């Protein structure tokens, strides 16, 4: 496969300000209405967050802009998206983005996400292709439009889908979805959340608590990555690609000391950075 | 996969005696029959349930049908009798016969 | 032709006994060795089979004495170590010559070795 | 499993990150030749492993004694090679009621020749022609050269020595990697030493109504003591006093 | 040059219960690399003997091969009413392979 | 288990006609495969080999017409293009295998007629 459409586009990365955001639970220990303080990797408040767009229509007619770059992992990574209609599935996290290293391949193929830690060959323009089988009338997902080779694989896992819809809501939710990715001490841990948002694009003032999903033996350093996509085929109209619109949020983590206020039920609301001002 | 034997078998010289080896559920055709003289090492009478080791007189036979394996000795003699065993075959461990003491009357 | 078994043992409960089965009269690496116990008033009991050339342990759990069989190939001996001796471990121990191939008779044995596990002294 | 391959292309399954059910292995007891190494089979229930290799194949009822770590004969010479220093167990039983079929079973194969003895644990799927004599056959068959592979002949008309064994071999190791594959009743209101999930302490365990979030493990108090823990086997909130 | 085969006789009209020896001779010394085939005219050539001295599944010992070197022998015994067909020998010693010209055993 | 052949027919001389033969039951891949010829009333004459386990192609020099042979291994199929035709090659062909003292794999196709003539 490795079908590719770079479609490079100009303009500066549109930034934003994470007000109170990216506060997960950095322990399993249940605490109630106490102020706990740790210095750990987080996304510090009032931070510069890049509102990127994987597919971006700027209207004249059509003009879908596929920009999503390979991005360094740096210290840690934060992620956020709305995507009432999912176009986002997983991420390619790795180092060489090639063989010679392992590869973190998260595919939330409906409905069983098959997390994969393997050695792949990722193409120049990787993303998940989706088509129509005509047998059983089902939309399959061609997974090798992402990567050519799959071999040597070190690890495999399956779970209930992290990406989840609700819909029926004609908006007013947008189903804002956040995922935090932190790679330490042999455990690369995943965090999640689902939130309604009525605002047009950017984030509210509310706090988002992210529980750890799975704590997995990863043992690889991931210095760079890119997201994944779900596109399809169309048929004769004046091939089809770039289903809907796609945009998401990315910011990098950083060691900071937060004071954590648990609730009577252990639901952290107020967190405060010490070094902020 | 456990085998069952009958506790004691009471017959006299010249009469034929049949001592069963009865295994729950499946059997393996092969089976191994053992003659234990009191406080003496049992000696193998029947190997494979179709053959007797060299030097073993011809009154000694073995066989099986269905879930059963018979030790069948013809023309008994007062010299011969002793407690009889079978051994299961394969199936991970071999459960040895509970044992059946052969008594011979007419003394 | 010859499996010679070490003298009888008497050991206090929970203790250990290793008994030897020495071999002669055939080719010692051409035959597996079964170890068989028989209790007071009770039947033959197979604890395990070993290999002369390698490990062969397929110990039926039965009475759990952490049993390990070792072959010393130089002397053509087979060994049986039985730990956590229990009041019902008091029984005669036979070693049994088996075929190297999947066939499994014991045609020739040792003579038996009695081990008494009793808190009472000899 | 329903379908084991032959020994020329034996299947290998790297297994880790799970728990061992070693009990029913011994409780199976329908298995012809079941031997082990490393340390005793009763001892291996808990003594556990970083990364195991479960590889299986089907061989003949006579050649299985060739399968032993450090022996000779065809299966260990050119087909499948146990190493010089080995840990695992050889598990062997008959599958005569499945494999050997009337009308003949010739699905199964093996390699009969190769120009060297086989390196340990490395299969040989290369079905090219070996040239025993010096006359080059060069891919096609001919003289001084034979075909590499051969079938077995399985029918239930075979004797007991010619019955197919589905030999599965388990091989083990130990590394800087942790034991990724590895094999007490609750007391309420009693001073009792304890361990939960490796967390250790001594306290009085009681029923408690404080309500965790699911992913959580411990509770804690103001003083960084371990105040409340959740029973892993049956989820319940247990105080520690 | 090529390896010549010599199949003799190239036909033999036979009767019930015979023991026909269909000879395939060779121009060179071939170890055992010779075969035999059943062909009723229009069928597929059903292999009878492989390596000139070994029987085949489905084919009982009414056929029986032997010979080596130059001389190879088809030992048909107790000739059956289905065995009357066109048969063939076969080298596999060198390249090119040649086959015999055929021997049609047929009802007298 | 089974071999199927491409369609035979009447072809003018000097032309070319690719021969397809697909396997079933067990693969082509691990074995070799052959072609042989039977003219009506004539003996079975070997034509050409294929050897997938390396790669090599041998032809009969008796009929040396560059009848090219190669594979479609992933379809268990084999292709020999009838090149440089001449009328005495008008015959039936078979897909073949030789038991070379090791195997018993001699499996034969159904047979299709190649015809080399200007008269259809
Ligand atoms: C993390 O992966 C990076 C590879 O991207 C490794 O960092 C490299 O380290 C060498 C020095 O040994 C530098 O010369 C390279 O420039 C580094 N890479 C980059 C991209 O800057 C590093 O080894 C890995 N982590 C660990 C703990 O080894
Ligand atoms: C964030 O970017 C703005 C420009 O959009 C710049 O003025 C500001 O200094 C930056 N701050 C940080 C912390 O990156």
PDB file of N, CA, C and O in Angstrom, chain F residues 41-80:
ATOM      1  N   UNK F  41      -2.054 -41.736 -30.232  1.00  0.00           N
ATOM      2  CA  UNK F  41      -1.310 -42.909 -30.622  1.00  0.00           C
ATOM      3  C   UNK F  41       0.170 -42.858 -30.328  1.00  0.00           C
ATOM      4  O   UNK F  41       0.862 -43.854 -30.559  1.00  0.00           O
ATOM      5  N   UNK F  42       0.681 -41.743 -29.819  1.00  0.00           N
ATOM      6  CA  UNK F  42       2.097 -41.603 -29.524  1.00  0.00           C
ATOM      7  C   UNK F  42       2.324 -41.699 -28.025  1.00  0.00           C
ATOM      8  O   UNK F  42       1.419 -41.459 -27.222  1.00  0.00           O
ATOM      9  N   UNK F  43       3.550 -42.042 -27.659  1.00  0.00           N
ATOM     10  CA  UNK F  43       3.906 -42.167 -26.264  1.00  0.00           C
ATOM     11  C   UNK F  43       3.941 -40.826 -25.561  1.00  0.00           C
ATOM     12  O   UNK F  43       3.879 -39.753 -26.159  1.00  0.00           O
ATOM     13  N   UNK F  44       4.031 -40.906 -24.239  1.00  0.00           N
ATOM     14  CA  UNK F  44       4.107 -39.721 -23.403  1.00  0.00           C
ATOM     15  C   UNK F  44       5.516 -39.157 -23.493  1.00  0.00           C
ATOM     16  O   UNK F  44       6.484 -39.831 -23.133  1.00  0.00           O
ATOM     17  N   UNK F  45       5.642 -37.941 -23.996  1.00  0.00           N
ATOM     18  CA  UNK F  45       6.935 -37.307 -24.194  1.00  0.00           C
ATOM     19  C   UNK F  45       7.049 -36.127 -23.248  1.00  0.00           C
ATOM     20  O   UNK F  45       6.222 -35.214 -23.289  1.00  0.00           O
ATOM     21  N   UNK F  46       8.071 -36.153 -22.404  1.00  0.00           N
ATOM     22  CA  UNK F  46       8.313 -35.077 -21.460  1.00  0.00           C
ATOM     23  C   UNK F  46       8.654 -33.783 -22.190  1.00  0.00           C
ATOM     24  O   UNK F  46       9.282 -33.789 -23.249  1.00  0.00           O
ATOM     25  N   UNK F  47       8.228 -32.659 -21.613  1.00  0.00           N
ATOM     26  CA  UNK F  47       8.395 -31.368 -22.265  1.00  0.00           C
ATOM     27  C   UNK F  47       9.353 -30.464 -21.500  1.00  0.00           C
ATOM     28  O   UNK F  47      10.433 -30.136 -21.999  1.00  0.00           O
ATOM     29  N   UNK F  48       8.984 -30.066 -20.282  1.00  0.00           N
ATOM     30  CA  UNK F  48       9.762 -29.071 -19.557  1.00  0.00           C
ATOM     31  C   UNK F  48       9.454 -29.148 -18.070  1.00  0.00           C
ATOM     32  O   UNK F  48       8.375 -29.593 -17.671  1.00  0.00           O
ATOM     33  N   UNK F  49      10.404 -28.687 -17.252  1.00  0.00           N
ATOM     34  CA  UNK F  49      10.251 -28.671 -15.801  1.00  0.00           C
ATOM     35  C   UNK F  49       9.942 -27.256 -15.350  1.00  0.00           C
ATOM     36  O   UNK F  49      10.041 -26.306 -16.131  1.00  0.00           O
ATOM     37  N   UNK F  50       9.571 -27.127 -14.086  1.00  0.00           N
ATOM     38  CA  UNK F  50       9.711 -25.883 -13.347  1.00  0.00           C
ATOM     39  C   UNK F  50      10.276 -26.284 -11.995  1.00  0.00           C
ATOM     40  O   UNK F  50      10.066 -27.407 -11.533  1.00  0.00           O
ATOM     41  N   UNK F  51      11.063 -25.399 -11.394  1.00  0.00           N
ATOM     42  CA  UNK F  51      11.673 -25.662 -10.097  1.00  0.00           C
ATOM     43  C   UNK F  51      11.539 -24.408  -9.255  1.00  0.00           C
ATOM     44  O   UNK F  51      12.382 -23.512  -9.344  1.00  0.00           O
ATOM     45  N   UNK F  52      10.488 -24.337  -8.439  1.00  0.00           N
ATOM     46  CA  UNK F  52      10.266 -23.118  -7.676  1.00  0.00           C
ATOM     47  C   UNK F  52      11.203 -22.986  -6.481  1.00  0.00           C
ATOM     48  O   UNK F  52      11.507 -21.858  -6.074  1.00  0.00           O
ATOM     49  N   UNK F  53      11.708 -24.092  -5.941  1.00  0.00           N
ATOM     50  CA  UNK F  53      12.420 -24.059  -4.666  1.00  0.00           C
ATOM     51  C   UNK F  53      13.775 -23.359  -4.759  1.00  0.00           C
ATOM     52  O   UNK F  53      14.350 -22.964  -3.741  1.00  0.00           O
ATOM     53  N   UNK F  54      14.290 -23.210  -5.971  1.00  0.00           N
ATOM     54  CA  UNK F  54      15.261 -22.177  -6.249  1.00  0.00           C
ATOM     55  C   UNK F  54      14.677 -21.220  -7.259  1.00  0.00           C
ATOM     56  O   UNK F  54      13.770 -20.449  -6.946  1.00  0.00           O
ATOM     57  N   UNK F  55      15.252 -21.251  -8.463  1.00  0.00           N
ATOM     58  CA  UNK F  55      14.572 -20.893  -9.707  1.00  0.00           C
ATOM     59  C   UNK F  55      15.416 -21.415 -10.854  1.00  0.00           C
ATOM     60  O   UNK F  55      16.568 -20.999 -11.016  1.00  0.00           O
ATOM     61  N   UNK F  56      14.840 -22.308 -11.653  1.00  0.00           N
ATOM     62  CA  UNK F  56      15.532 -22.866 -12.802  1.00  0.00           C
ATOM     63  C   UNK F  56      14.495 -23.470 -13.731  1.00  0.00           C
ATOM     64  O   UNK F  56      13.477 -24.006 -13.287  1.00  0.00           O
ATOM     65  N   UNK F  57      14.776 -23.387 -15.026  1.00  0.00           N
ATOM     66  CA  UNK F  57      13.867 -23.871 -16.053  1.00  0.00           C
ATOM     67  C   UNK F  57      14.644 -24.706 -17.059  1.00  0.00           C
ATOM     68  O   UNK F  57      15.622 -24.237 -17.646  1.00  0.00           O
ATOM     69  N   UNK F  58      14.243 -25.961 -17.218  1.00  0.00           N
ATOM     70  CA  UNK F  58      14.843 -26.850 -18.195  1.00  0.00           C
ATOM     71  C   UNK F  58      13.795 -27.263 -19.218  1.00  0.00           C
ATOM     72  O   UNK F  58      12.640 -27.552 -18.876  1.00  0.00           O
ATOM     73  N   UNK F  59      14.228 -27.298 -20.475  1.00  0.00           N
ATOM     74  CA  UNK F  59      13.382 -27.590 -21.618  1.00  0.00           C
ATOM     75  C   UNK F  59      13.921 -28.831 -22.305  1.00  0.00           C
ATOM     76  O   UNK F  59      15.116 -29.118 -22.238  1.00  0.00           O
ATOM     77  N   UNK F  60      13.039 -29.561 -22.978  1.00  0.00           N
ATOM     78  CA  UNK F  60      13.510 -30.622 -23.853  1.00  0.00           C
ATOM     79  C   UNK F  60      14.158 -30.010 -25.085  1.00  0.00           C
ATOM     80  O   UNK F  60      13.602 -29.101 -25.704  1.00  0.00           O
ATOM     81  N   UNK F  61      15.352 -30.484 -25.428  1.00  0.00           N
ATOM     82  CA  UNK F  61      15.963 -30.060 -26.679  1.00  0.00           C
ATOM     83  C   UNK F  61      15.391 -30.797 -27.876  1.00  0.00           C
ATOM     84  O   UNK F  61      15.658 -30.392 -29.012  1.00  0.00           O
ATOM     85  N   UNK F  62      14.628 -31.865 -27.643  1.00  0.00           N
ATOM     86  CA  UNK F  62      13.899 -32.525 -28.720  1.00  0.00           C
ATOM     87  C   UNK F  62      12.845 -31.597 -29.311  1.00  0.00           C
ATOM     88  O   UNK F  62      12.705 -31.492 -30.534  1.00  0.00           O
ATOM     89  N   UNK F  63      12.095 -30.914 -28.455  1.00  0.00           N
ATOM     90  CA  UNK F  63      11.205 -29.841 -28.875  1.00  0.00           C
ATOM     91  C   UNK F  63      11.714 -28.601 -28.155  1.00  0.00           C
ATOM     92  O   UNK F  63      11.257 -28.261 -27.057  1.00  0.00           O
ATOM     93  N   UNK F  64      12.663 -27.918 -28.778  1.00  0.00           N
ATOM     94  CA  UNK F  64      13.330 -26.761 -28.194  1.00  0.00           C
ATOM     95  C   UNK F  64      12.776 -25.540 -28.912  1.00  0.00           C
ATOM     96  O   UNK F  64      13.347 -25.066 -29.898  1.00  0.00           O
ATOM     97  N   UNK F  65      11.631 -25.059 -28.441  1.00  0.00           N
ATOM     98  CA  UNK F  65      10.972 -23.934 -29.057  1.00  0.00           C
ATOM     99  C   UNK F  65      10.858 -22.718 -28.175  1.00  0.00           C
ATOM    100  O   UNK F  65      10.070 -21.817 -28.497  1.00  0.00           O
ATOM    101  N   UNK F  66      11.624 -22.655 -27.078  1.00  0.00           N
ATOM    102  CA  UNK F  66      11.527 -21.621 -26.046  1.00  0.00           C
ATOM    103  C   UNK F  66      10.108 -21.516 -25.503  1.00  0.00           C
ATOM    104  O   UNK F  66       9.542 -20.431 -25.360  1.00  0.00           O
ATOM    105  N   UNK F  67       9.523 -22.674 -25.222  1.00  0.00           N
ATOM    106  CA  UNK F  67       8.255 -22.736 -24.518  1.00  0.00           C
ATOM    107  C   UNK F  67       8.480 -22.323 -23.076  1.00  0.00           C
ATOM    108  O   UNK F  67       8.905 -23.138 -22.252  1.00  0.00           O
ATOM    109  N   UNK F  68       8.203 -21.064 -22.764  1.00  0.00           N
ATOM    110  CA  UNK F  68       8.667 -20.499 -21.508  1.00  0.00           C
ATOM    111  C   UNK F  68       7.776 -20.920 -20.348  1.00  0.00           C
ATOM    112  O   UNK F  68       6.559 -21.062 -20.491  1.00  0.00           O
ATOM    113  N   UNK F  69       8.408 -21.155 -19.204  1.00  0.00           N
ATOM    114  CA  UNK F  69       7.740 -21.670 -18.020  1.00  0.00           C
ATOM    115  C   UNK F  69       8.089 -20.783 -16.833  1.00  0.00           C
ATOM    116  O   UNK F  69       9.255 -20.421 -16.631  1.00  0.00           O
ATOM    117  N   UNK F  70       7.064 -20.375 -16.097  1.00  0.00           N
ATOM    118  CA  UNK F  70       7.218 -19.690 -14.823  1.00  0.00           C
ATOM    119  C   UNK F  70       5.931 -19.890 -14.038  1.00  0.00           C
ATOM    120  O   UNK F  70       5.083 -20.714 -14.396  1.00  0.00           O
ATOM    121  N   UNK F  71       5.786 -19.128 -12.971  1.00  0.00           N
ATOM    122  CA  UNK F  71       4.857 -19.454 -11.911  1.00  0.00           C
ATOM    123  C   UNK F  71       3.743 -18.428 -11.809  1.00  0.00           C
ATOM    124  O   UNK F  71       3.793 -17.341 -12.390  1.00  0.00           O
ATOM    125  N   UNK F  72       2.709 -18.832 -11.079  1.00  0.00           N
ATOM    126  CA  UNK F  72       1.969 -17.958 -10.177  1.00  0.00           C
ATOM    127  C   UNK F  72       1.794 -18.783  -8.909  1.00  0.00           C
ATOM    128  O   UNK F  72       0.776 -19.461  -8.740  1.00  0.00           O
ATOM    129  N   UNK F  73       2.801 -18.728  -8.036  1.00  0.00           N
ATOM    130  CA  UNK F  73       2.866 -19.570  -6.847  1.00  0.00           C
ATOM    131  C   UNK F  73       1.744 -19.264  -5.866  1.00  0.00           C
ATOM    132  O   UNK F  73       1.215 -20.168  -5.212  1.00  0.00           O
ATOM    133  N   UNK F  74       1.369 -17.990  -5.765  1.00  0.00           N
ATOM    134  CA  UNK F  74       0.362 -17.583  -4.795  1.00  0.00           C
ATOM    135  C   UNK F  74      -1.037 -17.987  -5.236  1.00  0.00           C
ATOM    136  O   UNK F  74      -1.972 -17.956  -4.432  1.00  0.00           O
ATOM    137  N   UNK F  75      -1.206 -18.348  -6.504  1.00  0.00           N
ATOM    138  CA  UNK F  75      -2.427 -18.987  -6.955  1.00  0.00           C
ATOM    139  C   UNK F  75      -2.251 -20.480  -7.186  1.00  0.00           C
ATOM    140  O   UNK F  75      -3.201 -21.131  -7.640  1.00  0.00           O
ATOM    141  N   UNK F  76      -1.070 -21.023  -6.860  1.00  0.00           N
ATOM    142  CA  UNK F  76      -0.700 -22.431  -7.069  1.00  0.00           C
ATOM    143  C   UNK F  76      -0.885 -22.837  -8.527  1.00  0.00           C
ATOM    144  O   UNK F  76      -1.452 -23.880  -8.845  1.00  0.00           O
ATOM    145  N   UNK F  77      -0.386 -21.988  -9.415  1.00  0.00           N
ATOM    146  CA  UNK F  77      -0.677 -22.051 -10.834  1.00  0.00           C
ATOM    147  C   UNK F  77       0.652 -21.929 -11.566  1.00  0.00           C
ATOM    148  O   UNK F  77       1.638 -21.461 -10.999  1.00  0.00           O
ATOM    149  N   UNK F  78       0.691 -22.388 -12.812  1.00  0.00           N
ATOM    150  CA  UNK F  78       1.925 -22.459 -13.570  1.00  0.00           C
ATOM    151  C   UNK F  78       1.641 -22.166 -15.038  1.00  0.00           C
ATOM    152  O   UNK F  78       0.601 -22.561 -15.582  1.00  0.00           O
ATOM    153  N   UNK F  79       2.558 -21.417 -15.656  1.00  0.00           N
ATOM    154  CA  UNK F  79       2.343 -20.779 -16.952  1.00  0.00           C
ATOM    155  C   UNK F  79       3.470 -21.172 -17.892  1.00  0.00           C
ATOM    156  O   UNK F  79       4.634 -20.847 -17.636  1.00  0.00           O
ATOM    157  N   UNK F  80       3.126 -21.836 -18.988  1.00  0.00           N
ATOM    158  CA  UNK F  80       4.076 -22.141 -20.050  1.00  0.00           C
ATOM    159  C   UNK F  80       3.486 -21.684 -21.372  1.00  0.00           C
ATOM    160  O   UNK F  80       2.491 -22.243 -21.839  1.00  0.00           O
TER     161      UNK F  80
END
